[PDB]
Amino acid sequence: GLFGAIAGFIEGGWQGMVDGWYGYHHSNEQGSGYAADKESTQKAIDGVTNKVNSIIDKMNTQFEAVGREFNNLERRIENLNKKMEDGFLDVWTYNAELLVLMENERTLDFHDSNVKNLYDKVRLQLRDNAKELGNGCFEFYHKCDNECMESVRNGTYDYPQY
Amino acid sequence: GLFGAIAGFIEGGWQGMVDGWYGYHHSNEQGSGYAADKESTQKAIDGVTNKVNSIIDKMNTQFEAVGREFNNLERRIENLNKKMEDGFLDVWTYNAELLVLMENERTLDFHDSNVKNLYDKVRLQLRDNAKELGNGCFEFYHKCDNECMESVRNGTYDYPQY
Amino acid sequence: GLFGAIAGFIEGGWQGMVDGWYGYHHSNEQGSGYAADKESTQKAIDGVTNKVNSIIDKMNTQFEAVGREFNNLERRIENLNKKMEDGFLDVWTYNAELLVLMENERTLDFHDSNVKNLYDKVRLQLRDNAKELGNGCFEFYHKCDNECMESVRNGTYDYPQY
Amino acid sequence: DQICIGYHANNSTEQVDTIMEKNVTVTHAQDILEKTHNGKLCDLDGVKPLILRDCSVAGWLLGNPMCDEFINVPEWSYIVEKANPVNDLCYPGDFNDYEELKHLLSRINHFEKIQIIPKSSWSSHEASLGVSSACPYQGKSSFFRNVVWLIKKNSTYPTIKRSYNNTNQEDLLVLWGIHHPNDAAEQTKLYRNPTTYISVGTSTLNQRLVPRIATRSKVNGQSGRMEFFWTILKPNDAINFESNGNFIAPEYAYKIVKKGDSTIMKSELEYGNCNTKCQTPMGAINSSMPFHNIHPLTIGECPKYVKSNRLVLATGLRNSP
Amino acid sequence: DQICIGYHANNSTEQVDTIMEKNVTVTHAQDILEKTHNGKLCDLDGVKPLILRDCSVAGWLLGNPMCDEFINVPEWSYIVEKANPVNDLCYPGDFNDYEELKHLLSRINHFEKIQIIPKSSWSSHEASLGVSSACPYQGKSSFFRNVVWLIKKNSTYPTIKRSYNNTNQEDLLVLWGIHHPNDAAEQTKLYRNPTTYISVGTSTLNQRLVPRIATRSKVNGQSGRMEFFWTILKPNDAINFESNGNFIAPEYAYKIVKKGDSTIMKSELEYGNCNTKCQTPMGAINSSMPFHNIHPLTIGECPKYVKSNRLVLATGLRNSP
Amino acid sequence: DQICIGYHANNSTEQVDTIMEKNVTVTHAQDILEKTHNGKLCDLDGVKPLILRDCSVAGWLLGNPMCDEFINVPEWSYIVEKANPVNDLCYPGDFNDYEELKHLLSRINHFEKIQIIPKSSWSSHEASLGVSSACPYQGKSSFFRNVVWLIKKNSTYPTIKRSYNNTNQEDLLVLWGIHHPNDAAEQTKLYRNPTTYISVGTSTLNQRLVPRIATRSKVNGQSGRMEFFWTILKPNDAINFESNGNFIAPEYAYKIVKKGDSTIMKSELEYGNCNTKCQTPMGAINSSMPFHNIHPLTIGECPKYVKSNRLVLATGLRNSP
Ligand SMILES: CC(=O)N[C@@H]1[C@@H](O[C@@H]2O[C@H](CO)[C@H](O)[C@H](O[C@]3(C(=O)O)C[C@H](O)[C@@H](NC(C)=O)[C@H]([C@H](O)[C@H](O)CO)O3)[C@H]2O)[C@H](O)[C@@H](CO)O[C@H]1O
Ligand SMILES: CC(=O)N[C@@H]1[C@@H](O[C@@H]2O[C@H](CO)[C@H](O)[C@H](O[C@]3(C(=O)O)C[C@H](O)[C@@H](NC(C)=O)[C@H]([C@H](O)[C@H](O)CO)O3)[C@H]2O)[C@H](O)[C@@H](CO)O[C@H]1O
Ligand SMILES: CC(=O)N[C@@H]1[C@@H](O[C@@H]2O[C@H](CO)[C@H](O)[C@H](O[C@]3(C(=O)O)C[C@H](O)[C@@H](NC(C)=O)[C@H]([C@H](O)[C@H](O)CO)O3)[C@H]2O)[C@H](O)[C@@H](CO)O[C@H]1O
Ligand SMILES: *[C@@H]1O[C@H](CO)[C@@H](O)[C@H](O[C@@H]2O[C@H](CO)[C@@H](O)[C@H](O)[C@H]2NC(C)=O)[C@H]1NC(C)=O
Ligand SMILES: *[C@@H]1O[C@H](CO)[C@@H](O)[C@H](O[C@@H]2O[C@H](CO)[C@@H](O)[C@H](O)[C@H]2NC(C)=O)[C@H]1NC(C)=O
Ligand SMILES: *[C@@H]1O[C@H](CO)[C@@H](O)[C@H](O[C@@H]2O[C@H](CO)[C@@H](O)[C@H](O)[C@H]2NC(C)=O)[C@H]1NC(C)=O
Ligand SMILES: *[C@H]1O[C@H](CO)[C@@H](O[C@@H]2O[C@H](CO)[C@@H](O)[C@H](O)[C@H]2NC(C)=O)[C@H](O)[C@H]1NC(C)=O
Ligand SMILES: *[C@H]1O[C@H](CO)[C@@H](O[C@@H]2O[C@H](CO)[C@@H](O)[C@H](O)[C@H]2NC(C)=O)[C@H](O)[C@H]1NC(C)=O
Ligand SMILES: *[C@H]1O[C@H](CO)[C@@H](O[C@@H]2O[C@H](CO)[C@@H](O)[C@H](O)[C@H]2NC(C)=O)[C@H](O)[C@H]1NC(C)=O
Ligand SMILES: *[C@@H]1O[C@H](CO)[C@@H](O)[C@H](O)[C@H]1NC(C)=O
Ligand SMILES: *[C@@H]1O[C@H](CO)[C@@H](O)[C@H](O)[C@H]1NC(C)=O
Ligand SMILES: *[C@@H]1O[C@H](CO)[C@@H](O)[C@H](O)[C@H]1NC(C)=O
């Protein structure tokens, strides 16, 4: 993917993170677990929801065929009518299949972007207080309990305190 | 946004930077202020200017309706003509509204990209001689006067000198 | 470009790297040279190959003009037929030229992305064992022979060993 | 101790296509194409269609005796007609501007039939002998119920001069015809007068039909022909007939009480005893999808038709193996 | 000491839409859709349109006496015509291939009227008694100024045989007609001969019109009808008339001096005393936008028509609150 | 010691366009638009076209004596016809429903000509004097080879009554005509009977043609006219003629042995002695491109036509200077 996170430096997703699209997994003396990032997830849900409604809406106005009949000596205008109605159906079919193709690619990249941005947000907080493993994980130099973990998820992780 | 800078790790824009789209704000003993980055700004202006002209030009060739009349026993071909002219107007309306939607999203992302790239260019220069605050700002370890600031804006900031 | 690598922090390409699109150049006591990255290159080849076939295929179904003649008192339906066949040709011409424009931009950005991701993959391995020069190059603190180089290209560069 | 950033995965096998990659498994997707239908012709928002069955629009309107089912039909939502209905013009011939009429029906939801020229009314001419073997009913020679095939009474065919005034508020569809005989001996045998005509006038109409004689292949056992004409008689306007013979006079004419959205669907299917918001020739559609791929010609509140076999949007992200 | 990277913000309230987000405020934008118009019919690059006012193209060309304003009109840019012009065919009837003629006008910018058959020229027949109450002028019975309604002179209508040669370089539009009377007594009363015809010949044309008698509703106080025909007579070609009666002969025919871009605009508006580069039925457009949403049918150097209410491009970036 | 990440560059000058930037040099590209053609009319997958040369479809079918080349033509792939073929209707006139016929030919690949009414067969009437100067052969007055211009034999024209039964399996194209003379003296001079007719009947057809007299400009030295009509006679169906005069009777009629993909190409070019999979009016196309910009009207397995001058896809990356 374009932004390198999903199926990139982060090998794979997490079956164990059920309550969100993006989030955190922690490991310390007290235990381990997954926590979805609510803000980035909901932001992604809005983006995609609007995308779908925007797609549905743009395609709302589109050619509708009407039945027309012609006698045996009106073959030219019958054929004209046939090629006209088909022409539009092919144009609108193309429009629909391409829009899906293009926006599907953008939607997957969008998710990748959200993960990368979330990764970078944590990276900018930890800075030198943790070892960047290269796989999505940051290994702490100081010991980090559940409050310490929560503070990273908060955005309230104090560099000066550690 | 896709690239994380605009309304991301950089919370908001600057009312006080009037002479460009992207740039620098400095703070040292001698004072403070904004300086637009001319190169990245002008590059962005060219991109967008070409985009608009490309959009205008692509839509230059487009269906034009022509007046046609039909008598009371030509209702089928009248209706054919009606549905034909409407069909194209709907296709071209769709083409126009979608192109705008898609390129608007790309234009905003483009600006985000330009900011991120400019941020990273400065990041790669300062390296370890400054503390990356996580908000767009780099706090220097050495004291940094206006020449020192200017040298960062130059691209001529010597790591070995500091 | 959107991802900052190609013609960005990496000034230019390499005439001397002939066997791939992206790769490595090394310099040590024993010598120097180029090595293409096979994985990222082949991945890029598949992406572009599919793109082209997808473009060709989507445009497979498209309006075909048919010859129709009309006598001297059928000028309206002649003109209707003329404007109908032209209308579709203009719609399909637009569709073709725009699709090319849009996907060309995406294809160049795609390459940029692949380079950036490859750069970041190496960056995450070297970490503090090398000086990030800011131009695509990493200068090692320890001495780095051909095995040491190869291990970076492998993905098997051990931080603990150095 | 460590904290990791990562993303969702699940047991999903839903795939979507992109420009660069086909068949990409994703955690979540949204199908937007309706592919199914109930395979039946149904009522449209309660309102039953007019299913002509084996009758054609011509057979219905002129009143082919095989089309008694469709004498005085109620309001319809749409009309259904077979590709090649057997009960068309029983007596061989032509229906003038037939397609232009069919087009008018696409904007009509209800006719009310009324008598404009009573059959009894023809005192000077014979009105109960205008029948044929080509157009039978209950084993006997009958004829189009809405028009009267007039012939000579006691070896005379005096000039007819009849008028009808459209007093009622609604536009009126008037139907009449002309008979083309096989030879000169048939002409005199039915109408006496050798050279005849039928003149029809309204505000707009200025017609003058004359019988064209020619020897023709038998069609339904008859070589003669009928050529049916029509008009829309506006409110407060009169239609004026005059003829020496060969005149197929109106008895009943259809009143246009309701105009609205309608269509003439071509389908071999019969009634299904169902209801729907959206009907196609192949069956009815019940879905909230923005698209379908059943058939282009539809009626009602429908999704948009496309030629695709598959349209699925990614909502989720690339799912891990 | 610190240095920051950041981006522009301003007091802008301009919003643009994207696929994922509607109403995104941006620092800079470019509207590309013209929404306004002056609401007037104007000259097109100096050249005034032909505004038929209450006359129709038929009323103009045949020369309805209510359409004296449009006798010898100068070069036009486009033509304007009301939806239902009152001064159409004063004497009730039909204009044959009228739409096909109207189509020819869309390619014509100027006619020069010339006399091909002088009114005085009719020595054998009467030419100054061909008038009607349906077609009045200054309170008296008059007629279409460009054609002559010929009738019998001293109880005789000898066979007419007239020719016109198109000597002048320009294609010529020739107009003639035929009268359909109410009954046989009217036929003899005006033309004596009971069975008449009008034969018209050119290089291409091979016509033979005959009057159709029928009793018709009065329209503008008359039950008779006129049926007007036309042709384009090529250079150096002759048109040949011959008739026993019912002949509405040409006096004046229009010469096609200039062919170019033109159109027949349908509009109830009148002249506005303005000038423009781009005209629509609802008004004129003066803008450098690539698009507009006023009306599809335009003439001149115009933006492209779309059905949108709003088309705004982002030029700047997401503006901070 | 250092390791660098970088990308490919080469000596490529191939440029591609994007939305934001025109003329971007890239390392690799793929042109997808065919711009060239051989400039010739060729056979289509072996099958030679019917090149009418200076003859028109009318001149060919009716059998203009200048069109002897196209008497009994073999199966064709497509038909070629000039914009203004000189050898059209030698004897001036009209071809009724000519375009509708041309449309039928677009679906036909082969005719087999057969005699339905032998020339010798006309015992009551004269069949070898139906010729004209307008329609010459080898310096002498000849006529359309597929129809017989019948005239009176020994000052008499008895009523004709002929039938042909379509016994053969294939649909049959039947052609006939009617002669329009200049005056009443010409009518009697050729046919004796002053008032004539031609009645034509089939299962469907109910025709009754009558000669229209009018004085007309000479065209190819003749003021008379011919008006040619046609029908498709279904299998096992008969066509019935009857006439007093002016009848241009069929001799030969074309049998429709093969129906398929075909077209009538308008082109001034002649045969090129080549073969191709894809043919246009300007020349033939041999390429694997998805698009071309030669001409819209093509036949065969062709790329799609667009109006572009240039369509090039980026495959590689931005090439360094
Ligand atoms: C009376 C009888 O039995 N005659 C036998 C011949 O058959 C008749 O042939 C004629 C013309 O050749 C008609 O087709 C006759 O059919 C009808 C019909 O349509 O059924 C009979 C109707 O009564 C008559 N109706 C009216 C109102 O006139 C109708 C019309 O005349 C024609 O359709 C008008 O075109 O015709 C048919 O019964 C038979 O041909 C002959 C042996 O060859 O033997 C006769 O006894
Ligand atoms: C002469 C008169 O006053 N007659 C009274 C009758 O009215 C006349 O009725 C006739 C036919 O029924 C026409 O419509 C007459 O109208 C004109 C017209 O168009 O104005 C009179 C014109 O002079 C005449 N012009 C020509 C060239 O012939 C014209 C034509 O004949 C017809 O239009 C051809 O179709 O007709 C109308 O005045 C009235 O009906 C009767 C009482 O019922 O009293 C009569 O005195
Ligand atoms: C016989 C002769 O030489 N007459 C001289 C006149 O010329 C003749 O004028 C007539 C009518 O005015 C025809 O056009 C004659 O042309 C033909 C033709 O088409 O070539 C002659 C054909 O033999 C004849 N064919 C048939 C089957 O009838 C044909 C037809 O009659 C007409 O085409 C039917 O419309 O006409 C032409 O030769 C000449 O006009 C006169 C001096 O003015 O001198 C005459 O000697
Ligand atoms: C019958 O149709 C005629 C036209 O052929 C129409 O005029 C009649 O309506 C009446 O005509 C009178 C003039 O003859 C007129 O004075 C009267 O206003 C008009 N009535 C109406 C209701 O419009 C029609 N006959 C009727 C209504 O009895
Ligand atoms: C009038 O129209 C006739 C055709 O009906 C046309 O032929 C005349 O032009 C002249 O005809 C002469 C033959 O009759 C011919 O010899 C002469 O070249 C031709 N003149 C021109 C200029 O083409 C027309 N009459 C004229 C021009 O007086
Ligand atoms: C000639 O065409 C007639 C119709 O005009 C057609 O009916 C003939 O075919 C035969 O007609 C017979 C009745 O007259 C019928 O009994 C017979 O089945 C039928 N033959 C075929 C093969 O269909 C045609 N004449 C023939 C075939 O000789
Ligand atoms: C997020 O979490 C941190 C750590 O869990 C919160 O800080 C604690 O807040 C509790 C409850 O108010 C206090 O009693 C503790 O003294 C705090 N502990 C530490 C280590 O800071 C913090 O308030 C939260 N901030 C948010 C949600 O914005
Ligand atoms: C950009 O700015 C730096 C610092 O302001 C410039 O370096 C100075 O240049 C001036 C004028 O030539 C010299 O007198 C000083 O000695 C320099 N001072 C320092 C601290 O370097 C530099 O020349 C500029 N480079 C550009 C614009 O490329
Ligand atoms: C990639 O390269 C490294 C270094 O060249 C490989 O490690 C060497 O492998 C060889 C051959 O098996 C051994 O004999 C050496 O002892 C190794 N040297 C070092 C410095 O590690 C490594 O096996 C390769 N890994 C891949 C291709 O995945
Ligand atoms: C994608 O999957 C479909 C059905 O599962 C299969 O038929 C098709 O060949 C696949 N296409 C590609 C490009 O792998
Ligand atoms: C966007 O703004 C318009 C007008 O300001 C408003 O009517 C519309 O509802 C808004 N749309 C959305 C999706 O917020
Ligand atoms: C791009 O190149 C073409 C041909 O090489 C040239 O004519 C054109 O003007 C150039 N366009 C731009 C926008 O530079």
Numbering used by the authors:
A (entry chain B), B (entry chain B), C (entry chain B): 1 to 162
D (entry chain A), E (entry chain A), F (entry chain A): 1 to 321
Task: Kindly provide excerpts from the paper associated with this entry.
However, it has been established for the H1 (1918), H2 (1957) and H3 (1968) pandemic viruses that a change in the binding specificity of the virus membrane glycoprotein, Haemagglutinin (HA), of avian viruses from a preference for α-2,3-linked sialo-saccharides (avian receptor) to a preference for α-2,6-linked sialo-saccharides (human receptor) is a prerequisite for efficient transmission of avian viruses to humans. However, surveillance of human H5 viruses has revealed a number of H5 mutants that show enhanced human receptor binding with HAs that contain other amino acid substitutions in the receptor binding sub-domain. We have carried out structural studies on the HAs of a number of H5 mutants that were isolated from infected humans in Vietnam and Egypt to explain differences in their receptor binding properties. None of the substituted residues in the mutants we have characterised make direct interactions with the receptors; they appear to have their effects by perturbing the biochemical properties of the receptor binding pocket.
